[PDB]
Amino acid sequence: DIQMTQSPSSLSASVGDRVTITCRASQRIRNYLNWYQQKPGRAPKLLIYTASKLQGGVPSRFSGSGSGTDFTLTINSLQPEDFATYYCQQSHETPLTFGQGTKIEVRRTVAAPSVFIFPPSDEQLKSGTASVVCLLNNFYPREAKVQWKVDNALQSGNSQESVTEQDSKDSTYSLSSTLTLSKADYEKHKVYACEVTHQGLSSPVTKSFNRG
């Protein structure tokens, strides 16, 4: 099988920028390399076929180059509708294989998250389970670290995170971390705290509550 490696995996850029992304094949594929665009919740669109030929209807600011193992996609003058994920795909032999994708996101100024912690509702506790939620609201860049501590004891393996797509109006991200405990475990401890590390924060911020 032919492995396709795209670089970078994520790219921050502004409207009007010239962006190039690379696609390396693990073996020669001649010029049979295609590029696709995909946005959340919609099917991919063919942009370039056979390495450098523009698909009809695709804006001329897209161009492709390469043959063999080294290929590049260039977007001249990035436009708002170009922020999306891009995949390369070799089409010289089966299995047809794709790169891991390159996500082009909107660059903006660093923004620290607003942090909120939510205790479990009394209603949920009747079911034998407690969910504790930590919200990181409207921050940039995407990278952030959230750690749970119960009575100052670091929690591991009992939380799940979710992150929104980049916001269309302010280009920020938001993130939730949910700590799941048994009712018995929850009622055994007093202090529940969420500690957040982010580039926009000079020092980690902690939000906490006391059970009851």
């Binding site: 991919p44 089409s91 509702s121 919200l135 938001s174």
Partner: protein, 232 residues
């Protein structure tokens, strides 16, 4: 203008079977070779199968060999994917895609994929799981009593333990949209999904403005409205 539409996706138990169909309008499908691909939640694109315009050539990814069968009916202007011995990891959006024709000289059936896929359908979702259809429980994420005076407060709803996807969430029956973040669902170890929806509002409004999240889970015909208020 051409159209390509997949159908047949649904919920299946592990080991079950399912048949997907791909129907087109505006052109003769038999003039084109065809492929099936899939995209698991939050993951990349995976090629699955290929069939030549005549139907004489077929190729398969190792991941589905011996379990899936691609076919087509040129009179019915359709392409099909028969799936058997389905596994949880087969959960994905399944795409039917037409292979692009050559600009001058045509690619024979045995290598008909050389020029990429120029028309895709919007996909059909296949979910393989042992979980049973179940509506969500909705719990309040109550605004903190420490909310800054004259500042910004956060509140939300936890939508827990439903199956299958999707659920939709609104706030105040659509009157509250600014500042809302409805997170993508996470699949829990129980096989059930959970998500939270949050919104930031003026702290001064917590005493006067009622906040309600409206949750709809069509697979179980469940609608839930949960008032989120400061805890006494």
């Amino acid at each position: 203008e051409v159209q390509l539409v997949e159908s047949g996706g649904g919920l299946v138990k592990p080991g079950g079977s399912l048949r997907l169909s791909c129907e087109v309008s505006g052109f003769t499908f038999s003039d084109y070779h065809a492929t099936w691909l899939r995209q698991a939640p939050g993951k990349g694109l995976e090629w699955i199968s290929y069939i030549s315009g005549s139907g004489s050539t077929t190729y398969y990814a190792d991941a589905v060999k011996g379990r899936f069968t691609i076919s087509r009916d040129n009179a019915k202007n359709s392409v099909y994917l028969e799936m058997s011995s389905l596994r949880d990891e087969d959960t994905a959006v399944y795409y039917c895609a037409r292979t692009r024709l050559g600009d001058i000289v045509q690619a024979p059936g045995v290598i008909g994929y050389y020029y990429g896929m120029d028309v895709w359908g919007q996909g059909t979702t296949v979910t393989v799981s042992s979980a049973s259809t179940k509506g969500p429980s909705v719990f309040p994420l109550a605004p903190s009593s420490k909310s800054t005076s004259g500042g910004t407060a956060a509140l939300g709803c936890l939508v827990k333990d439903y199956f299958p996807e999707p659920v939709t969430v609104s706030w105040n029956s659509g009157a509250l949209t600014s500042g809302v973040h409805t997170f993508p669902a996470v699949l829990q170890s129980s096989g059930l999904y959970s998500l939270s929806s949050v919104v930031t509002v003026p702290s001064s409004s917590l005493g006067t403005q009622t906040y309600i999240c409206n949750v709809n889970h069509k697979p179980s015909n469940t609608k839930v409205d949960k008032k989120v208020e400061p805890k006494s």
